[PDB]
Amino acid sequence: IVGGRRARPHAWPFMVSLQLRGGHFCGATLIAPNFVMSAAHCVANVNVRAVRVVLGAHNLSRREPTRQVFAVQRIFEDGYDPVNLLNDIVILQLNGSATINANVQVAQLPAQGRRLGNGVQCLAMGWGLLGRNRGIASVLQELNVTVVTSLCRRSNVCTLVRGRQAGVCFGDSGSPLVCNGLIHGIASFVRGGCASGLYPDAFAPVAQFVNWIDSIIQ
């Protein structure tokens, strides 16, 4: 996240970090005790059996007793299209169930087909790049964004920070977009570099996949 602020510790208990060594590469959202939702492109050319799913984290550079670490057992994809970047969503089944507590909780999803119009105020968040100065963030960042149609496709939810250069960046993919307390987006792609000040950020529209998610989840 570029131009955002540190989140209050454990303010978003559904926030997940996907790691390869002990290196964060994508975010995710806890949707059930044993399932996380992320962007398909995050797991496309990665060694899935090597991915660690980190729950209850705040500061990645610190030892945090609040953490819960899981492995990936199965992957559920919908119609991921890497050329067009459509259906950039994946469900990952954990090798166990999280211990729900103050620091780890399940996110609330929107109803199927609910669409956001121009002007809805939402919060983006992630541990991605801070700009081109600053690599990945250590502490979770959050950012107020506005939904915009316009320089956006009907197949995405796009956002823009008006009047300043701010936005999601590499490493933010898979992280939630929260609007009116529900998960409405999954960070998918940028255009013109991160925080162009032109080109809205693009998210996978979770409302369009609710029926599918449920079918797997419950």
Binding site: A39, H41, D88, D172, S173, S188, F189, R191
Partner: peptide, 4 residues
């Protein structure tokens, strides 16, 4: 577009 660059996937993030």
């Amino acid at each position: 577009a660059a996937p993030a």
